[PDB]
């Protein structure tokens, strides 16, 4: 038969390995010829695998590249202006790749040009609370200083935003061994650790969902009208550059001024971690000078879009998407995900050649320019937003399949919790010691839910990946899954470095490609069920449970300020009422879904439309404050860390640091406004599940 | 059988007459007890007529009322400050109503309080071009002056906005006999003309679609958080009051300064129509003083919502809605429409009692507080926006059924043109001389299309009525129809006056209620077809024809500036390309709609969803510039006259008066941006009609 078991059994570890090798021999940087050639290859292969149509969708978007004849670097300069120490111009290439052409040197994409010179302030992870500690407690002024921050904990674009608002004139980002060197493991090529010359690339935008900085709201097609640079979205105002820990040690060792305020400020290098400003007395006249010469450039990018037309509901789309562009070789990021998508397409195509079609249409996507700010997925969704909002059932992401080899990680909408528990109970665990047991059993054992016994942890969707437009802008139920470590926002040690190669994966992460196969089964199995189940596999009651958890959470935050809640009459009663109503209505809808006349395809589709439009109901067309492309009222990326999800984000940001606002009546008024918007949106989403007439 | 003929034959002129009499014996001002009682009566009657459910939906919204113990009036004051002339405190009540309680005196709803005193400038109709003529050509400065403007031509809220921006400190609105006294007809009670003591009530907001001024975006429910007055939407900044032509003559007769610039500035009173400022030499020391004491007040309003559940597609809604609140008796506005809705409900209920149900759900609405800014319809749509955007098939409005007795008037989306031509060919003409001929024949003969021989005129939807939220905010296909005169934006002579009574209609407009019956057949027949036709009765090819007409029109406007189009490379090629593509794709969709396997209900509903979501595709979630609740890219209310529709409004407003902008590069850049947005939206709407996979 053609059922999910036939699909899953066709997936092969050895195929995923072959595809990964094939995708990682040369760099595939967005906007380069090599990445266009790989796009054409995937288009051709998906056609041969049997998809109905496979097209390239191109856009011309703002990208950023170093200047090949005017390299970026940082110096220590003495009082005469001689450069006595320079940081590296490139990472030492790994064995056997020392002659590979077109490895982009480490840089921070979208940095402006400049050569600022000044004194160093060390700002730990450059988090909002790190800057609070510096200004408010230690009384250190970052204005006109160059800040040096360690990578880790939060998205680097938030670090740069925080440094700008502190008045910094430049930012140096570096990888501390505390965060990127696991104890007892060797440096690449002899293990999976970051060597001292390794450096993490990455963009430093603050797009808040906008996509291409020059075309917010509309696809960057041939006739698009572009903002000028000065009005672009999300560009940093100060120069930024990343370095490795050999170079950081040279910048940090001479630091003077104030001692670190506590041990959470100290990394693992043999330096004091002094906050500064500037260097100890002997070197007090030396300064640090950046030299950044990168350029922003409108450049063509290419998404591959494959279609497998549905047999019964061709106007309902289940999307499996992940990116193709990499910083260098992309051994983990993204090609361990792209190889998994390739094998899933191949498997679905095998069934199609034998005469099967899924019930609903499946769309497969290979996105471009993700590393430069989710640009390819966002421009495509801008072009196709009307089709997606009326027809989009679900989006399953497919970036890196592995970030470790310990257990499964799933982040998704509550609407998919039941689907994921049920599927993982049917899959075999690949873990040592769990031979013959389910993936559900190994996952629940290694990653227990903090809330429920005998359940696994499933996280909120945050951002920093290509589901953002589909979930937080358009309100399409979304999910992601990968194998993970036992620190989740800092990246694995060789993240975005030249050392992330096929050999890294084959030698140190997944020699038998069994974790890749398990992830292919989870992502593919989810797509299969979403595209084939007669009734969509969403359980609205799971949203009711989480809404109550998030309401309790945000109420608890507010209750730290009881005097103000009395003065300004701040009540959460309306939000709890809406959550209670959602719980009651979802329970009654679930009974009808179980009970309805199963011979009636209009009641079924009516009820399938109620399930599909439930995530859509949490969208507010006015967006969140000053972030028009984050429209979901229950979930947004954290305003302090794009990678993390925040619940009831409008109320959360209205309450954050509220005790510091100079006009408390205005600040608590805005808390009340956000409570009203959240209560109304929960009630309105509940009412979409009521009987329709 | 139960078919459209059974529905239409059940409608009775005599029933419409009985209901009109019943609805017009006492005033039904929004927010008053009498209007709540009428809402309860209609709820009870719709239940008895046989609807499945009938509920009141209430909201607490900002309304405005005069102060009963501190009356509004205008004076001429002499140099000592004695008030030598006062305008009336009330309209003389009509025969037999001189003892009716609670007639609200003439006032401009939402005027602020004040007692400004100054010199008079006469500004004709206070249109944008009238103010251009005064400032630019005649060099008259309105700053610190009281302006006097005649009603007519444009919505009075636009007149007040224009007067504010000219620096006026108050506005006096009056009815000139040129616009409100037809030659050879007697004044009320002896004919349908405005007497000299008659006055037009009406609000002077500039809401731009927002609804309740205090709650833009969200329903004004029990827990709503309200803007403060200073941040409310759309409130005027200067006092405003309306007067009749006996009083206007006293204010205008003493005017001096400049002569009227031409005859288009002169009305029909025996005065010079001097523009001012101020009075002729003998009276040069007299001034005009306003006394406005009205108050804005959050007040409860009540919509009645009736449901007739669909037999096959209960999750598809066809809405028939019109308002119930009136300024005084509402003999024409709205009760000639509300009586027609009442008879339509009664007829559908007769069929239902015999066992019939429509295919799709029909919703019937009696809206409140329309006269205060479309508040009841807009708050309800804000509450129910998710249901409406995913399920709303069409909205048919039902305000005044008559504004004359000459011929039919229809304004609607192009998607309903074919429906209207086909229905009116099946209906009998009620017109003298067309006995035995179709309504299509009489209408086409009396109101020929300016574009096509043998076709009738159908206008764009403008605004100033309760379809605005459904069409321009939410993108639901909408239409309206009424009997009309042979000046369409000024209102009939007794518009919004105490003289608009049952006797006005029964004696002078429609003694046999035949025009009311014809309008009931058109509105009811449209609802019937939309709710019962297997394939939705929309023709996408009609949108293609009009899009080309509007593209030619906006290109022609731009081509008045050939030098600038050369300098700034302003091309319309992308918009014509999108319109050509829409034409081709709509032609192919129409072939499939005719050809598809008619046994397949999923292809049918898939294709019905493509038809329903086509109007929805013209919505831009970012809205038009500075008007976030006007989201349709093809149609918006004119920025110069809310009642009129404008096509390609984003490009139109970017081009308007562009030769006066101080930075032409910036102004033509914004023209190009609006061309890009319009081209993209037309192409994206076209693509919703392509094969789905
Ligand atoms: C009305 O409908 C038509 C389709 O019938 C649309 O036509 C498209 O028009 C655009 C022009 O705006 C064409 O864009 C061009 O695409 C070329 C590559 O196309 C190939 O590859 C894609 C896969 O991604 C296929 O879809 C396609 O069939 C082709 O196989 C580019 O090479 C072109 O860019 C080059 O020329 C331009 C202009 O000189 C330069 O600015 C560039 O730098 C570059 O050198 C260009 O981008 C597109 O191919 C057409 N599609 C077709 C025929 O299917 C219209 O766009 C549509 N109107 C609107 C308003 O949408
Ligand atoms: C969770 O779900 C429940 C329903 O199970 C919703 O309950 C509604 O709650 C509101 C309160 O916010 C109630 O509003 C009150 O309505 C009264 C009139 O109700 C009658 O008429 C309507 C027809 O319009 C019917 O729908 C209804 O069944 C009743 O027949 C008003 O008189 C009340 O106003 C008075 O009291 C308040 C508070 O003291 C004053 O501020 C006012 O000035 C006034 O004196 C009030 O507006 C509503 O009736 C409830 N509906 C029910 C039970 O069906 C919850 O609202 C919902 N939670 C959320 C967040 O939506
Ligand atoms: C994850 O798996 C769980 C466990 O299988 C699953 O929950 C189960 O769903 C089924 C529906 O397939 C439920 O079975 C129903 O139970 C009610 C009450 O006992 C019956 O009335 C239902 O009978 C109707 O429907 C049948 C078809 O399903 C017809 O044969 C019948 O004639 C009736 O029309 C029906 O049997 C079962 O109760 C739950 N078990 C639970 C909740 O413990 C869950 O749905 C899966 N999650 C997904 C798919 O997302
Ligand atoms: C307004 O009225 C006009 C005039 O009636 C109407 O246009 C007509 O619509 C009918 C569809 O009902 C068209 O008839 C079709 O013509 C094509 C080509 O000749 C045929 O292939 C079609 O046959 C298929 O469908 C039939 C059911 O309709 C089946 O019996 C058959 O087996 C095939 O499946 C079909 O007969 C007719 O051509 C037009 N006439 C025109 C455009 O002049 C218009 O639709 C009405 N507007 C509305 C309802 O909004
Ligand atoms: C990755 O695999 C692809 C597909 O097998 C290879 O591209 C093919 O290469 C052969 C030999 O040059 C050609 O005859 C085909 O036309 C290519 N097919 C396609 C679809 O492009 C490619 O060589 C492999 N890359 C690496 C680095 O091994
Ligand atoms: C760090 O790099 C800089 C730039 O290449 C070096 O300084 C240059 O040295 C050359 C040759 O002596 C001079 O002609 C240039 O004028 C210098 N440029 C600048 C900008 O100072 C510097 O020598 C390097 N420092 C170390 C320690 O290697
Ligand atoms: C308008 O018609 C309604 C409905 O016939 C009248 O209200 C009814 O009046 C009688 C007598 O007072 C009562 O017994 C009923 O309870 C009322 N019914 C409803 C549904 O309200 C009303 O009197 C009429 N109004 C006028 C001005 O004629
Ligand atoms: C117009 O109305 C005003 C206000 O009622 C009249 O002026 C008042 O006259 C009374 C009685 O003589 C005085 O006690 C008040 O002080 C006056 N009020 C003001 C504001 O001036 C005025 O007489 C009326 N004019 C005409 C021509 O009827
Ligand atoms: C390793 C995690 C924390 C981040 C990783 N995502 C990314 O690397 N995204 C890129 C682009 C993110 C964006 O621009 O939003 C970045 O963070 O530089 C992932 O989701 O696998
Ligand atoms: C008589 C026409 C021009 C206007 C009439 N509409 C109205 O009277 N609407 C009211 C409220 C309009 C609004 O606030 O937008 C008004 O114009 O004062 C109608 O559409 O029948
Ligand atoms: C890069 O640097 C070179 C050499 O200094 C210079 O000539 C050129 O202008 C720069 N290129 C770009 C693209 O800015
Ligand atoms: C930090 O330094 C700058 C200039 O040196 C100054 O303008 C700013 O107010 C300072 N902030 C403090 C002391 O908080
Ligand atoms: C793979 O698993 C083993 C066993 O737990 C572990 O020691 C090793 O660190 C893992 N490799 C990676 C890259 O995490
Ligand atoms: C209306 O005017 C009276 C009498 O001058 C005054 O006492 C009252 O304050 C006013 N009422 C309102 C509602 O403003
Ligand atoms: C109109 O008058 C006011 C003050 O009397 C002045 O500020 C304004 O600039 C004048 N405008 C002109 C003369 O255009
Ligand atoms: C009704 O129709 C007649 C005949 O054309 C016309 O003279 C009269 O003015 C009409 N009444 C109204 C109110 O227009
Ligand atoms: Ca864009
Ligand atoms: Ca509102
Ligand atoms: Cl992922
Ligand atoms: Cl109307
Ligand atoms: Zn990635
Ligand atoms: Zn990455
Ligand atoms: Zn009206
Ligand atoms: Zn009116």
From Swiss-Prot, chains A, B:
Binding annotation for Zn(2+) 2:
333, 371, 496
pH-related activity info reads: Stable at pH greater than 6.5.
Task: Enumerate the glycosylated residues.
Answer: 22, 67, 86, 99, 141, 282, 405, 422, 581
Q: What residues bind Ca(2+), as annotated? A: 215, 218, 379, 382
Q: Which gene encodes it?
A: FOLH1
What are the entry keywords? Calcium, Carboxypeptidase, Cell membrane, Cytoplasm, Dipeptidase, Glycoprotein, Hydrolase, Membrane, Metal-binding, Metalloprotease, Multifunctional enzyme, Phosphoprotein, Protease, Signal-anchor, Transmembrane, Transmembrane helix, Zinc
Question: What is the protein's name according to its record?
Answer: Glutamate carboxypeptidase 2
Impact reported for residue 421 to Y: Correlates with lower folate and higher homocysteine levels
CDD domains, per database record? M28_PSMA_like, PA_GCPII_like
Q: What does this protein do?
A: Has both folate hydrolase and N-acetylated-alpha-linked-acidic dipeptidase (NAALADase) activity. Has a preference for tri-alpha-glutamate peptides. In the intestine, required for the uptake of folate. In the brain, modulates excitatory neurotransmission through the hydrolysis of the neuropeptide, N-aceylaspartylglutamate (NAAG), thereby releasing glutamate. Involved in prostate tumor progression.
**Record-annotated residues binding substrate?**
156, 203, 370, 463-465, 480-482, 495-496, 642-643
Give any Gene Ontology cellular component. Answer: extracellular exosome
Q: In which tissues does this protein get expressed?
A: Highly expressed in prostate epithelium. Detected in urinary bladder, kidney, testis, ovary, fallopian tube, breast, adrenal gland, liver, esophagus, stomach, small intestine, colon and brain (at protein level). Detected in the small intestine, brain, kidney, liver, spleen, colon, trachea, spinal cord and the capillary endothelium of a variety of tumors. Expressed specifically in jejunum brush border membranes. In the brain, highly expressed in the ventral striatum and brain stem. Also expressed in fetal liver and kidney. Isoform PSMA' is the most abundant form in normal prostate.
Q: Return the cofactor note field.
A: Binds 2 Zn(2+) ions per subunit. Required for NAALADase activity.
Q: What is the effect of changing residue 282 to A?
A: Loss of glycosylation. Reduces enzyme activity
Q: Which GO terms describe its biological process?
A: C-terminal protein deglutamylation; folic acid-containing compound metabolic process; proteolysis
User: Binding of Zn(2+) 1: at which residues?
Assistant: 323, 333, 399
What changing residue 334 to A does, per the record, is:
No effect on enzyme activity
């Amino acid at each position: 038969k053609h059922n999910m078991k036939a699909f899953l059994d066709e997936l092969k570890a050895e195929n995923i390995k072959k595809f990964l090798y094939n995708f990682t021999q040369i760099p595939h940087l967005a906007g380069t010829e090599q990445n266009f050639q790989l796009a054409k290859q995937i288009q051709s292969q998906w056609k041969e695998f049997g998809l109905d149509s496979v097209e390239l969708a191109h856009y011309d978007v703002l990208l950023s590249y170093p200047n090949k004849t005017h390299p970026n670097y940082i110096s220590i300069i003495n009082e005469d202006g001689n450069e006595i120490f320079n940081t590296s111009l490139f990472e030492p290439p790994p064995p056997g790749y020392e002659n590979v052409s077109d490895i982009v040197p480490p840089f921070s994409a979208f940095s402006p040009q400049g050569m600022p010179e000044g004194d160093l302030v060390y700002v730990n992870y450059a988090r909002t609370e790190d800057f609070f500690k510096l200004e408010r407690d230690m009384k250190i002024n970052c204005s006109g200083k160059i800040v040096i921050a360690r990578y880790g904990k939060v998205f680097r674009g938030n670090k740069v935003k925080n440094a700008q608002l502190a008045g910094a004139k430049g930012v140096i980002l570096y990888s501390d061994p505390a965060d990127y060197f696991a104890p007892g493991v060797k440096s690449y090529p002899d293990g999976w650790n970051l060597p001292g010359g390794g450096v993490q690339r990455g963009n430093i935008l603050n797009l808040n969902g906008a996509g291409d900085p020059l075309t917010p709201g509309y696809p960057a097609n041939e006739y698009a009208y572009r903002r000028g640079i000065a009005e672009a979205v999300g560009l940093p105002s100060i120069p930024v550059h990343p370095i490795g820990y050999y170079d950081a040690q040279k910048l940090l060792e001479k630091m003077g001024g104030s001692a670190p305020p506590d041990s959470s400020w100290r990394g693992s290098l043999k330096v004091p971690y002094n906050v500064g400003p500037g260097f100890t007395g002997n070197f007090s006249t030396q300064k640090v000078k950046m030299h950044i010469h990168s350029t922003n450039e409108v450049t063509r990018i290419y998404n591959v879009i494959g279609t497998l037309r549905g047999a019964v509901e061709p106007d309902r789309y289940v999307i499996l998407g992940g990116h193709r562009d990499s910083w260098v070789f992309g051994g983990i990021d993204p090609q361990s995900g792209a190889a998994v998508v390739h094998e899933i397409v191949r498997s679905f195509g095998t069934l199609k050649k034998e005469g099967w079609r899924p019930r609903r249409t499946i769309l497969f996507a290979s996105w471009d320019a993700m590393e430069f700010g989710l640009l390819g997925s966002t421009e495509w969704a801008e072009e196709n937003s009307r089709l997606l909002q009326e027809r989009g059932v679900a989006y399953i992401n497919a970036d890196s399949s592995i970030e470790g080899n310990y257990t499964l990680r799933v982040d998704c909408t509550p609407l998919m919790y039941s689907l994921v528990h049920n599927l993982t109970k049917e899959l075999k665990s690949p873990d040592e010691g769990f031979e013959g047991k389910s993936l559900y059993e190994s996952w629940t054992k290694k990653s227990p839910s903090p809330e429920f016994s005998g359940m696994p942890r499933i996280s909120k969707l945050g951002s920093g990946n290509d589901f953002e437009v589909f979930f937080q802008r358009l309100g399409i139920a979304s999910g992601r899954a990968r194998y993970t470590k036992n620190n989740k926002f800092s990246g694995y040690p060789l993240y975005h470095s030249v050392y992330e190669t096929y050999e890294l994966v084959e030698k140190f992460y997944d020699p038998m490609f069994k974790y890749h196969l398990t992830v292919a089964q989870v992502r593919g199995g989810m797509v299969f069920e979403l595209a084939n189940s007669i009734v969509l596999p969403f359980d609205c009651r799971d949203y009711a449970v989480v809404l109550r958890k998030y309401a309790d959470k945000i109420y608890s935050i507010s209750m730290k300020h009881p005097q103000e809640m009395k003065t300004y009459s701040v009540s959460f009663d309306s939000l709890f009422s809406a959550v209670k109503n959602f719980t009651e209505i979802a329970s009654k809808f679930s009974e009808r879904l179980q009970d309805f006349d199963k011979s009636n395809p209009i009641v079924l589709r009516m009820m399938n439309d109620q399930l599909m439009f439930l995530e859509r109901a949490f969208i507010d067309p006015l967006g969140l404050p000053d972030r028009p492309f984050y429209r979901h009222v229950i979930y947004a990326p954290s305003s302090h860390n794009k990678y993390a999800g925040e619940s009831f984000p409008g109320i959360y940001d209205a309450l954050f640091d509220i005790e510091s606002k100079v006009d408390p009546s205005k600040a608590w008024g805005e808390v009340k406004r956000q409570i009203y918007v959240a209560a109304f949106t929960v009630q309105a989403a509940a009412e979409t599940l009521s009987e329709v007439a």
